[PDB]
């Protein structure tokens, strides 16, 4: 069952096609979140994203026939399509965009200076005690939009369900918390159909506006999960994730859209030193083999470049599809939802669908953990300096598994590509993990 979906941040349409054929369909992965399709302005900061010039779907990704055509084939092989949504703004100040439309002084191709709220700028003191600026200034500059305008809400209803005829299944409302949640509703009720829409809203509590006023709208974004678990994971001990979730104050599950990081904090776009990254190695396995494996929300896998230091640069100048060969895994292109044990978790997480309860959690109080989804899966992390040799018990059958962190199951099922793992008559599994490693193991990848 598909259960996970990622974020392929900056990649352009093809790639995203060649992609959806070629690995995220045949692995399972229900879902891309894609770059802001629409014009944008010029320049080479991954950032330009954000500033909307219109709604044509020319843009730093590719033309309009490439974007259709990505959604084609991304369909056909079974993964849907989520655009990030400008639901907020428009750009700063004045240029050219994508498409060669001309705009400045709050005056675009299909916007007028009196489509906008007047100039004011939010302060970071407005967070906490002024939800009118909050929602009526300026984000860095960025022309607010007017969201409770009949007219501003019919043009971006018409840009989300021209998306949808074309076969769009899912949007991410971006700087949702800068826009009224009862203008959201107005703008829901202007949409097509119930497509999957996610609403970006950060709140770690004391706010003056809350993610808990979004809840009604769609699913939104849990950006405590991300900050604790990078957290507990770097400074605190992994058996205080035994009711992780409802029980540490999160959103409800079936609300929550989580990851280990995003796009924006994983570059100090608000985001702290404790958010874990691709930087972190082996940190970040670990990190995402908990997420995906712990029955708490809608998580997306990130998938980044690297991007040398310079937290405002673009992606490589080289495709990740380059004549024959995979711009992966170096100092281009991470591609992070290829990794052996977030691919793996993944695989875990669509396998175990039919259980969402943790069940038989173990722990050493302190860095060493163990639980089940009943009888479709078990698994263990070892965040010690030392092996962990412990018994643990399963719901499990017995017999031996791929531990599918390390490796799969062969197609005539009589063999795996890493280490198996036993489960014995009754049940326990004799762990032999090393020093930050894990396993996971699932009643699809049994040996026969
Ligand atoms: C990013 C984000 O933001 C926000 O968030 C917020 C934050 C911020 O920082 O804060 C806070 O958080 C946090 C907390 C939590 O709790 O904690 C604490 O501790 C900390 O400290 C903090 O941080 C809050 O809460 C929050 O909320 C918002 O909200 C969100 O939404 C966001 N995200 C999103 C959105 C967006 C927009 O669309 C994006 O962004 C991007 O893009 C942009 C655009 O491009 C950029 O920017 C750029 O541009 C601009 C224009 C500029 N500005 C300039 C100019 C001017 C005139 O023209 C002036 O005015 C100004 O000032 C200047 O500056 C800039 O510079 C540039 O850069 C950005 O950056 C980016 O980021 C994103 O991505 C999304 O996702
Ligand atoms: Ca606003
Ligand atoms: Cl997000």
Redesign the pocket.
Same mark, same amino acid.
């Given at each position: 069952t598909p259960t996970t979906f990622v974020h392929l941040f900056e990649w352009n349409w093809q790639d995203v096609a060649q992609e959806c054929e070629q690995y995220l369909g045949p692995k399972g992965y229900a879902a891309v979140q894609v770059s802001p399709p629409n014009e944008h302005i010029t320049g080479s900061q991954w950032?330009?994203r954000?500033?909307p010039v219109s709604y044509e779907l020319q843009s730093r990704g590719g033309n309009r026939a490439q974007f259709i055509d990505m959604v084609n084939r991304c369909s056909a092989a079974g993964v849907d399509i989520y655009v990030d949504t400008?639901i907020?703004?428009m750009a700063?100040?004045s240029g050219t965009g994508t498409a060669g439309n001309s705009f400045g002084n709050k005056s675009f191709p299909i916007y007028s200076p009196q489509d906008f709220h007047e100039s004011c700028?939010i302060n970071?003191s407005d967070?906490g005690n002024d939800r009118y600026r909050v929602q009526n200034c300026?984000?860095?500059?960025?022309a607010d939009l007017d969201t409770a305008s009949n007219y501003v809400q019919n043009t971006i209803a018409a840009y989300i369900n021209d998306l949808q005829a074309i076969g769009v299944k899912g949007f991410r409302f971006?700087?949702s918390? $800068?826009v009224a949640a009862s203008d959201i509703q107005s703008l829901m009720a202007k949409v097509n159909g119930s497509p999957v829409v996610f609403q970006?809203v950060?709140?770690?509590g004391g706010?003056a506006v809350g993610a808990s006023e979004y809840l009604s709208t769609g699913l939104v974004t849990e950006?405590k999960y991300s900050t604790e678990l990078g957290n507990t994971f770097r400074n605190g001990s992994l058996a205080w994730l035994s009711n992780f979730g409802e029980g540490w104050g999160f959103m409800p599950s079936s609300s929550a859209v989580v990851f280990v990081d995003?796009?924006?904090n994983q570059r100090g $776009?608000?985001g702290?030193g404790n958010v874990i990254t691709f930087e972190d190695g082996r940190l970040y396995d670990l990190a995402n083999v908990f997420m995906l494996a712990y029955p708490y929300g809608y998580p997306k896998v990130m998938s980044s470049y690297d991007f040398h230091g310079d937290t405002?640069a673009g992606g490589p100048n080289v495709p990740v599809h380059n004549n024959g060969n995979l711009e992966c895994f170096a100092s281009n292109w991470k591609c992070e939802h290829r990794w052996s044990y977030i691919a793996g978790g993944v695989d875990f997480r669509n396998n175990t669908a039919d259980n969402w309860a943790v069940t038989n959690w173990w722990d050493n109080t302190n860095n060493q953990i163990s639980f089940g989804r009943g009888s479709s899966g078990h698994m263990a992390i070892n965040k010690e300096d030392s092996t962990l040799t412990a018994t643990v018990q399963t719901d499990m059958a017995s017999g031996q598994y791929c531990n599918v962190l390390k490796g799969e199951l062969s197609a005539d099922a009589k063999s795996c590509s890493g280490e198996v793992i036993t489960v014995n008559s009754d049940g326990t599994i004799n762990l032999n993990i090393g020093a930050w490693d894990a396993m996971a193991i699932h009643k699809n990848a049994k040996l026969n």
């Open positions: 950032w330009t954000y500033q400008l907020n703004h700063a100040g700028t970071n967070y300026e984000l860095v500059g960025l971006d700087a918390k $800068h970006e950060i709140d770690q706010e950006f995003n796009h924006d $776009h608000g702290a405002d």
